[PDB]
Amino acid sequence: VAYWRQAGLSYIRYSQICAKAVRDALKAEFKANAEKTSGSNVKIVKVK
C-alpha cells in the first residue's frame, strides 16, 4: 500500500508516469527511441 494505493489508481497508471519521466531526461540523440515506442495510437470505441 502507498499513496497511489487507497486513492483509486492502478499499477499501469503508476507505471505510465514513472516511465514517462525517463523519456524526458534523455538527451537529444536518444529522443527518437522515446518517440519510437510512444504507444498512443489505439482508439476507444464503446457502444454507449
Binding site: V1, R5, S10, Y11, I12, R13, S15, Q16, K36, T37, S38, G39, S40, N41, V42, K43, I44, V45, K46, V47
Partner: protein, 109 residues
C-alpha cells in the same frame, strides 16, 4: 474492427469495449498498456478469462491458438503459492495486473 464487424449481428449485446485503428502502424508496448488499463477501470470485475490469437509457425502455415488469463488474485492463491515468499494480496494485486499487459503485447506481436 473486423472482429466487431463480423460479430455485430449475433453478439451485439455481449461486447464490453472495442478498440479500433489497430494494424496500420506497428504495435508497441504503450498500446498494450492503453488496452490493459481500460480493461480494469470499466466497472466489470471478472474472475477468469482467455485470449485467442494467431501464433504462426512459418511463412506458409500459421495457427490460431488459445491461452488463459488468471486475472483473479484468489484463483492465483492456491497450494503452489504457499511455497513462495512474503507476497501479500497487495503485491500479487500489482503483479497479476502487469502480466495482463504482457500477454496482450505477446498477442499483438
Amino acid at each position: 474492427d473486423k472482429i466487431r464487424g463480423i460479430l455485430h449481428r449475433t453478439h451485439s449485446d455481449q461486447f464490453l469495449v472495442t478498440f479500433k485503428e489497430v494494424g496500420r502502424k506497428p504495435p508497441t508496448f504503450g498500446d498494450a498498456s492503453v488496452i490493459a488499463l481500460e480493461l480494469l477501470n470499466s466497472g466489470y470485475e471478472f474472475d477468469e478469462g482467455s485470449i485467442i490469437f494467431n501464433r504462426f509457425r512459418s511463412v506458409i502455415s500459421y495457427k490460431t491458438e488459445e491461452k488463459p488469463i488468471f486475472s483473479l488474485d484468489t484463483v492465483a492463491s492456491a497450494e503452489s503459492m504457499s511455497i513462495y515468499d512474503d507476497i501479500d494480496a497487495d503485491v500479487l494485486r500489482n503483479y497479476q495486473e502487469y502480466s495482463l499487459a504482457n500477454i496482450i503485447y505477446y498477442s499483438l506481436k
